[PDB]
Structures are given as C-alpha cells and as structure tokens.
C-alpha cells in the first residue's frame, strides 16, 4: 500500500552519541540508525478498564451517537539499528488513533 | 493426584519459601566469593527468566563453553561455604514454626518432601475441588464423555478456576461430547478471555499462574489462542470440496485482525497457519476448477477470470511462507510445500 | 421504575444513581431515555 | 443536577425563539474510565415547522 | 467497620443468628416440638450469661466453627433424640447445617460489619480434627455446668442398634457389647457426657461417653470373635461378612460417608477418592449439582467480570446438554441376605482383617486419632482386667 512504500522512503534517521572511544576522534564510532519498517492500521476497537477486557468492533453509530472521533488504533514497526548493523531492535509502536474512512478497507462496514 | 484449580494455601509455603532462598542467597554469595520475599525477587534477578514457553530449552549447538574446573568439590570445600550460611539460616529459623523448621533443615540435608502441599490443605472449598480435579482426569482417561462434562460444569461453577485445565479439558471434553459445543466456541471464548495484549512477564513471584498454558497478549504467545485457529482450520476442511459459508473467509479476517501487534507481531504459525488457511483457499478453487481442465471440456467460459484469482493467491501465499521463513520461523518444512505448491500448479494448467 | 433502553442490545433496564453507566446486559455505554405513559396535549394541526 | 459546592438545585435552561419537543435524550458514560455519575446527556429536540410566508420554494 | 467491644456484640450476635437457623431447619428435618427449639435457646442463653461477665473488654468468646454444633449436640443429648458421629454425617451429606458458610445470616450487612477480629472468621472456616470435635463439647460443658443442668448426657441404645445396623448387623451383638457395657462400663450404668473440662489443656481424659461405647463395640467383636469356643460363628463367615460390605451404593448414607471422606484427611478415604465406584462417582457429580450451589450466590466489576461469567456458564451450559438407588434398610437387608449362609492362624487374621475394617468406619465419622482411638482401646483394656 501507498504508506508503507511512503515509510519505505524516508529511509534512516543517523545520530552518533559521540562514540567516545578514547579515526576513534573523527570517525566516532557511534552510529545510530533509526527507521520505520512497517506501518499497520487496525479496525476501530475499544476496551475498557484497559487490557483486562474484552474486545469490541466499534461501529460509526457509536461514534455519532457517543459525538465522538471513529479512530483506530495506528501502529508502525520501529526499527532501532545499532552500529549499522551491530544490534537490530524491533518495536511495535501505537501511534494513538488515526481515523479511519467509513467504508474503506478500515471500516467495519 | 492432579493439578489443583487455585492459588495455593499461602501460609506456610510462604516462609518455607523465605527460608529457601535466603539460604540460596547466603550459601551462592559465598560460592559466588570464594570464586573470586526481597531475597526472593533478588533470586530472580541473578538469573533471569525462561521467557515463553516452559523449559530454556535452545539448541545444543553452537557455543562450546568448555566445562572442566576439575569437579571442584572436596567435601571439605563445600562444609567451608556452608558452615556460615546454616547459622545465619537459624536466626529466621527460630522466628519460624516447627513444621518449617525440620522442613529447612530436611531440603538444607538435600531431602525432598513426600508430603504435598496439596495433601493436606484442609479447606471445605478446596478439598472437594481435589476431588473433582481428580474425577474428571480418571473419567477423561477411560472416554466416559457424559460423567466427564458433568464433573467439568460443576468444577468451573465453583470459586476455584483460572482457565487452568478449563481450557485444557474444557476443549478435550468438547471434542470428546459428541452432543453440543465446538471446542472453537469455548476456544473463541477462551481468546476473547485472556488476550492479555498487555506485555507482562519477570518481575513478581508467579507462583498463582505459571504455565504458558494460560497468559500472553504481550509477546508469549497463548496456546489456547494458536489452538483456536488450528482447530478453526480443521472445522474449514471437514466437507468443504469433498452464502452460508463464510468460514475460510471468517478465519481470513480475524487473523488480519491481528497481523502482529502480539500475535503477528511475534512470529510463526501466526504466519505459517495463516498461510496454510490460504494454501487450502487455493486447493479448494482448483478442485472448483480442476477436474477435466477445471470441470471438464475447456472452458471457453470466459478467460478463466478463474486462474487469474487463483495465481494471484498462489502468489501471495509464496509471501506469507517465506515472511514466516525469514523471521526466524521454527516449524515450516519448505521443499515439501514448494513441492506440493509446484505439482498443484500443474493441475491449474 | 424509571427505564433507559441499550443502545446496543435492546435491554430494557432501570439505571439508579449507585450504578454504572453501562448496560448490564451487553455492556455498552449508551442508553436511550426510554418514553413513557405521560400525558401531552395536541392541537390536531 | 445538583453541586454540593452550592448546595443548590441547578438546572439548564432551554433559550430558543420557538418551542421544542424532546425526540431523544441519551445517557453517555461512553470513553470514560468510570465516570458513573452520568455527566454527560444528548438531548435531540424537535421543533416543527409548518409552512408559513416567508419560507421558500 | 467495627472493632473492639461492639465489633464483638455483633459478631456475637450474627453467632446468635446462625446457631438460630440451625436449631429451626433441625426442627424440620427431625420435628421435635417446642422441645427441641426452646431447650436449646436458653442453653445459649445460659452461654450468653457468662460472655457478659467477663466482659470489660473479654474477647475469649467468639465461638469456634464446632462450638454451634457442640450446643445443639448438648441440648440433643438433653432432648435425648440422637448421636453425634450419625448426625455429623448427615449435617455434612445434606448441608443440613449452614455451619460450612457463613454468608447466610440476614447479614449482608453483618458481612460489611465489617470482621473486627471477628465475623468474617465465622461461617465455614475448616473441617474437625481429631477430638477436636469435643475438645469443645467438654469446654461449652464447661462454660455451661451442663451435667448438673441436663439429664442423662452421652447415653442413647440408639447409638448402639446405629453401630450393629452400621455393618455387621450381628442381632446378637448388639447386648453382647450393651453387656459389656453393662460390665464395667461404668459400672453397667448409661455414659453420661464427659465434665466442664475447665482446665484449658484438655487433657485427654476419653471421657467422652461414645468414644468408649465405639471402643466396647470393637472389643465385643474382637473377644466374643475370638472366643467362641462352641464355634457358632464359622471360620468362613467372618470374612464373607467382610467381602459382602467393602463398599456398596448407599440409599444416601453411604453416598453421605462418601461426602465426609472427602474432606481428604488422613488418606483412608482419600484413595476412595480414586476409586470412586463408577456411580458413586455419578450420584458424587448429583450431589455436587444440588447442593454445591449452595455455593456462591464479582461484585461491580462494571456487571463486565460477572456478565462474562454468565454467558461462561451459558457455553458449558450443560446440567443435561428401580427411582434406581435404594434406601437404607434396603441395602441393610439384602446384605443380611447375603451372609444368608450361616446355618487357626487364618481366622486370627481375618477377625484382625474386619476390625482395622470397623476401625476405618467409626473413626472415620470420627477425629480419629490413628491411635488415640487405640489410646482409647488400651485405656478400657486397662480398666477390664480388675476382675
Ligand atoms: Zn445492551
């Protein structure tokens, strides 16, 4: 889908802690690569008391009737490269709530 | 004899437990030197936990730690580390009853207790609970299938069940009751009662819930949840190419539901099931397109919009199985599916 | 008995101010302020 | 509704040019965390409107 | 939310109450008139008197889950009407007694009274140890003075025609061991209860009337067996009167001391657990449906903990997705039938076999005491031998 070949091209965001190291005092030795691998798109659900509960689709009438945004849950798989490859970190990371079009392949209906 | 539906009498596996570890505690520092409830926790952290699954079992090849360090152990050398550690097991040792006194001073001599501490709990609730336990495993280990739901029903009715063996007999016994219930139900129920999106592990002393038999939603997968899609899977099969339909659509869309957050997010079956769910999407529509050049004489019926559907998904499922691959995957034997994959492409042309 | 509906599944019910606002019967958060036998007059146009 | 603050019964009023009649009134505890006092009421009202010089066509 | 003196009162008075919901569903399983009821009022009443004396600031009263038990089985023995082992069992089997749980009362609120050292330590802590059982009846005689107060206490022929019936109903044996008994058990008079055991050690005394009455009966058997020189009781028959009883159905009994071996004590009946006779395993899951509901009834939880609940059990759903059993003096008879043939070193053995058989059965209704049972046995073996 579009975004995820949108999340393929911003690519990474480099930062060196200043590797101290004690080439070690210019080259650093500090790299750190961040990136966006994937990003996904849930179906609008919400449980209550947090987690502990069961889950439910939650439907555009809830949404007008509760005169409220019909969100869903946006998440995107962070990528936390270390030394350009020496340790490689996966998290997959909720962005709070996107929302969704009525009838797309993100709604319900 | 079985396993008991509840926490455990905490009174005095309590301060057994205190005792044991601050032994633990003072006889491995020690060891730890001459190398050169807190202590509970503090016994944890000086190694680690077993992550999800049962027993840190990975592998036996790779590393070769050479282990010789001679044996190291001249009686004499052990009674200098523990001749320190037993006096300083005493002072709590007075503070303690008894019973849990000689029970120290039983698993400090290295004995290990016969007597069960589910062999004496003498609590009305609990008690009967044993019996019940017990009743349904010897009914379940001779099929008697209208003795074994009756004992089951009654078991979960009383205050004393954490799905535990619910989940593990409450599927046996639904498969087994010819009568009413799919497993899947009270498996899609089971889902929907411990999803446990919520990513918790280490920190306290699990000693209510342990078994990766009930826990999850986080990253240790559930088995009750990998077995409601297995079993989901096997209820598509059973006379389907031998509106109403639905199911391996059903199974298409709550597993996208998903696509990894604990589930996806994870690994395997997750996938590969997924995948197996698909490839049977693609056998089903070559056999409703198959015999005789897909029914029979041709085609002609308009391109055959037919095999394009079915390419598409062959293609797709490719995807799903080298994803599965990739990731580090644990279970797919893929020169058998290829194989098959190949062959059953043959039957499309 | 005062009486509000469920928005979700049709359960009549009677809320007091010692429960939670959530239908006891499916669970949802929404309820209809059900009608009731209240006399209300009409000119006719 | 009533505030122990002011220990007072306080009531919204209605301010419109014309009279209404309550279609719906809904009860919402909806995305709270608990939030049982009910604090929250949609009221719908209906305000008829006959044909009358003036309106367009 | 009470603590202190009147947290007391009221965990005194919800100790009022439940002992009065006990004494009226007595009524009605055994209708026994204003008698029964009235009797037993002022025994607690008479208990009553000596709380308030000590009182100041006198926590030693909250009665024990046996104490209730022990003041209807006082007032019983006043009435007379039966025994202790008999209606234990019975009170375990049908839930007779609300004694397993507390929740009952018309508390609600007296559970919110909050527990103050108390009323949440009442109803349904734990099953009787040992004597235990008494290790209360003597101390409540003792708080009540009880023996100069009632007649003839621990006494009942009752009990023993119960114990004959119970197995072995040997007809015969019934005034061999009321013989006995009328020998030196208490120099042929009817055992009274035991004393105010005052002292706080409760020594154990084997005062306790039955105790000894079991104790004559399993001795009875054991000489009169032993000694039956003309041989009117055949080598064979004893033991056929052992292979006709190890277990059966029970037209309720039975099932009953099934009910109370599972309170899974010393493993005597604890294998009985696993074994479980098919049925006696189905009439088991019966009994469990019935009267196990008397259970329970989490609370608020958004109706969301309890609602799931609900629809739980409406997934398992189940309870369904000659009359057969027999009654008592049925099964009585027809095992009477079954020794229906009676017209060295083996018979030592089997008459030992039996005896470890009846020693399971009366001291299983019993605190048993592996040995103070025997403790008991060598006691009277001691008193006999003053011929
Ligand atoms: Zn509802």
């Known amino acids: 889908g579009l975004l995820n070949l949108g999340v393929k091209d911003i690519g990474e965001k480099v930062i060196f802690d200043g590797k101290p190291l004690n080439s070690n005092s210019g080259y650093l030795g500090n790299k750190l690569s961040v990136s966006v691998e994937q990003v996904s798109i849930a179906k609008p659900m919400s449980n209550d008391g947090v987690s502990s509960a069961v889950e439910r689709k939650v439907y555009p009438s809830e949404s007008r009737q509760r005169l409220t945004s019909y969100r869903g849950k946006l998440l995107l798989k962070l990528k936390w490269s270390v030394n350009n490859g020496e340790e490689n970190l996966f998290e997959v990371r909720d962005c709070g709530g996107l929302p969704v079009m009525l009838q797309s392949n993100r709604c319900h209906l | ?349 | 008995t005062l009486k509000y509906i469920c928005a979700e599944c049709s359960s009549k019910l009677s809320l007091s101010r010692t429960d939670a606002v959530r239908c006891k019967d499916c669970g949802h958060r929404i309820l209809l302020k059900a009608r009731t036998k209240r006399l209300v007059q009409f000119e006719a146009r | 509704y009533f505030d122990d603050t002011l220990n007072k019964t306080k009531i919204k009023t209605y301010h419109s040019s014309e009279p209404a009649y309550i279609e719906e009134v809904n009860l919402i505890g909806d995305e709270s965390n608990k939030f049982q006092e009910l604090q929250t009421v949609s009221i719908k009202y209906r305000i008829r409107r006959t044909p009358q010089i003036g309106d367009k066509f | 939310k009470l603590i202190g003196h009147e947290a007391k009162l009221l965990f005194l008075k919800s100790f009022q109450f439940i002992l009065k919901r006990q004494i009226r569903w007595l009524i009605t399983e055994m209708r026994f008139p204003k008698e029964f009821e009235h009797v037993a009022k002022i025994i607690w009443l008479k208990i009553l008197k000596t709380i308030n004396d000590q009182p100041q600031e006198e926590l030693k009263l909250q009665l024990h889950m046996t104490s209730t038990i022990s003041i209807l089985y006082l007032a019983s023995t006043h009435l007379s009407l039966p025994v202790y082992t008999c209606d234990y069992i019975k009170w375990i089997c049908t839930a007779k007694m609300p004694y397993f749980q507390a929740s009952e009362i018309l508390p609600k609120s007296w559970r919110i009274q909050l527990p103050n050292y108390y009323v949440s330590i009442l109803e349904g802590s734990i099953s009787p140890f040992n004597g235990q059982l008494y290790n209360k009846i003597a101390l409540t005689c003792g708080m009540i003075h009880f023996k100069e107060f009632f007649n003839s206490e621990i006494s009942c022929q009752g009990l023993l025609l119960k114990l004959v019936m119970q197995c072995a109903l040997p007809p015969e044996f019934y005034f061999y061991t009321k013989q006995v008994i009328e020998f030196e058990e208490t120099d042929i008079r009817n055992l009274t209860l035991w004393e105010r055991t005052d002292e706080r050690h409760t020594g154990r005394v084997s005062n306790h009337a039955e105790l000894r009455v079991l104790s004559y009966f399993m001795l009875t058997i054991n000489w009169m067996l032993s000694f039956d020189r003309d041989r009117q009781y055949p080598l064979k028959w004893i033991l056929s009167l052992t292979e006709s009883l190890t277990q059966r159905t029970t037209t309720s009994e039975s099932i009953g001391r099934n009910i109370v071996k599972v309170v899974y004590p010393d493993k005597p009946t604890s294998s009985d657990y696993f074994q479980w006779s098919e049925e006696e395993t189905l009439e088991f899951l019966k009994w469990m449906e019935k009267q196990f509901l008397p259970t329970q009834t989490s609370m608020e939880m958004t109706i969301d903990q309890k609602i799931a609940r609900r629809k739980l059990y409406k997934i398992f759903p189940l309870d369904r997705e000659d009359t057969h059993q027999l009654t008592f003096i049925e099964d009585l008879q027809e095992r009477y039938a079954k020794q229906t043939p009676f017209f060295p070193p083996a018979r030592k053995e089997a008459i030992g076999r039996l005896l470890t058989h009846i020693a399971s059965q009366l001291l299983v209704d019993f605190a048993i005491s592996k040995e103070q049972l025997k403790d008991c046995i060598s006691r009277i073996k001691n008193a006999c031998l003053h011929r």
């Open chain 2, 1 to 349: 004899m079985f396993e008991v539906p509840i926490t455990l009498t905490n009174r005095k596996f309590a301060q057994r437990r205190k005792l044991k570890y601050q032994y633990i505690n003072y006889i491995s520092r020690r060891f730890d030197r001459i190398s050169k409830s807190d202590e509970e926790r503090k016994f944890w952290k000086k190694y680690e936990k077993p992550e999800k699954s049962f027993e840190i079992w990975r592998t036996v090849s790779s590393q070769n730690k050479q282990p010789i360090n001679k044996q190291k152990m001249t009686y004499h050398n052990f009674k200098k580390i523990e001749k320190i550690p037993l006096r300083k097991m005493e002072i709590p040792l007075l503070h303690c009853t008894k019973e849990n006194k000689l029970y120290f001073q039983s698993i400090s001599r290295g004995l290990e207790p016969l007597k069960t501490s589910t062999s004496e709990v003498r609590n009305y609730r609990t008690r009967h609970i044993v019996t019940l336990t017990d009743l349904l495993h010897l009914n379940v280990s001779r099929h008697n299938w209208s003795l074994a739901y009756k004992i089951f029903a009654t078991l979960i009715r009383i205050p004393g069940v954490q799905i535990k063996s619910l989940w593990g007999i409450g599927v046996e016994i639904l498969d087994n009751l010819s009568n009413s219930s799919s497993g899947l139900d009270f498996l899609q129920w089971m889902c929907q009662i411990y999803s446990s999106k919520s990513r918790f592990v280490q920190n306290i002393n699990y000693r209510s819930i342990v078994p990766p038999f009930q826990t999850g939603s986080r990253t240790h997968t559930a088995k009750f949840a990998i077995t409601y899609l297995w079993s989901s899977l096997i209820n598509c099969q059973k006379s389907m190419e031998p509106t109403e339909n639905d199911l391996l659509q059903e199974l298409i869309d709550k597993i996208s539901e998903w696509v990894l957050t604990p589930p996806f997010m994870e690994d395997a079956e997750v996938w590969f099931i997924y995948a197996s769910c698909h490839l049977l999407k693609a056998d089903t529509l070559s056999r409703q397109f198959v015999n005789d050049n897909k029914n029979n004489d041709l085609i002609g019926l308009d391109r055959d919009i037919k095999i394009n559907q079915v390419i598409k998904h062959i293609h797709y499922v490719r995807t799903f199985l080298k994803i599965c691959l990739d990731k580090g995957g644990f279970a797919v034997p893929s020169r058998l599916i290829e194989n098959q994959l190949k062959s059953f492409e043959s039957r499309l042309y």
